[PDB]
Amino acid sequence: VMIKLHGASISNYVNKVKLGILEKGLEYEQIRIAPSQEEDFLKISPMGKIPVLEMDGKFIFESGAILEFLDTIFPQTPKLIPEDPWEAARVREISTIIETYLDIPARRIYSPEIVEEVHSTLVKGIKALQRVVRFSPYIAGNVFTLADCSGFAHLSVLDEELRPFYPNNHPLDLLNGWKEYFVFMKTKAGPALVEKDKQILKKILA
């Protein structure tokens, strides 16, 4: 509609944005593309990454910037950024811990030495996350926020993608509240659609 979301459902970062869009009840069309280094794509997305949000003939190309922007131009509940400034800091912190300290490192695994080195980094990252999450029932508290966008998109991937490498050792197993949060989020229409599209794509490609 007024909004186009450029990028396939294979991308954690695309799914992050898609979650916030769906929860806001916004009309949008998802354009299913892969990242590209083609000059013409670099004009709208300088690093050649997805997702890219498009609206009013203009583009935003960082998933964080995108959701902060949607938050600002569509300020109605659910507010991706809480009105309470302390609660907002907690939400941004959770999203940053998940992306920078969990996902980035986990992207070394998606060799033996690395698996080991990576497993320890994730354990540390998970023990830190544990200190700021509430899961009551949402990741930062009792309402949906930007942190649920990052949390459901990134952690559902981490958990699944690493269940074979850490069969009895899964770092995310140390995150109290996660399995139950994951189940709860999947009962909601937005995250269920996000998960469905991802599963379809993964059955297709496999």
Q: Phi first, then psi: what are they for 55, rounded to 5°?
A: -160, 135
DSSP string of 78-129, one letter each residue: S-SS-SSHHHHHHHHHHHHIIIIIIIHHHTT---HHHHHHHHHHHHHHHHHH
Strand (E) or helix (H) holding 5: strand 3-6
Strand (E) or helix (H) holding 14: helix 12-24
Q: Is residue 11 within the footprint of Cl ion (CB under 5 A)? A: yes
Q: Is residue 73 within the footprint of its own copies (CB under 8 A)? A: yes
How far apart CA 148 and CA 138 sit, in angstroms, is: 7
The stretch near its own copies (CB under 8 A) out of 1-9, 13-21, 28-36, 87-95 is: 87-95
Q: Is residue 107 within the footprint of its own copies (CB under 8 A)? A: no
Q: Is residue 122 within the footprint of its own copies (CB under 8 A)? A: no
The stretch near Cl ion (CB under 5 A) out of 6-14, 18-26, 111-119, 177-185 is: 6-14
Nearest to 189 by CA among 16, 19, 51, 7: 19
What part of residues 15-34 is at the interface with Cl ion (CB under 5 A)?
32
**Angle, CA of 190, 204 and 151, to the nearest 5°:** 35
Minimum CB distance to Cl ion smaller for 115 or for 201: 201
Q: Is residue 177 within the footprint of its own copies (CB under 8 A)? A: no
**49 annotated ligand-binding residue:** yes
Residues that bind its own copies (CB under 8 A): 42-43, 46-47, 58, 60-62, 64-66, 68-69, 72-73, 85-86, 88-89, 92-93, 96-97, 101, 104, 124-125, 127-129, 131-132
Residue positions forming the annotated binding site for glutathione = 49-50, 63
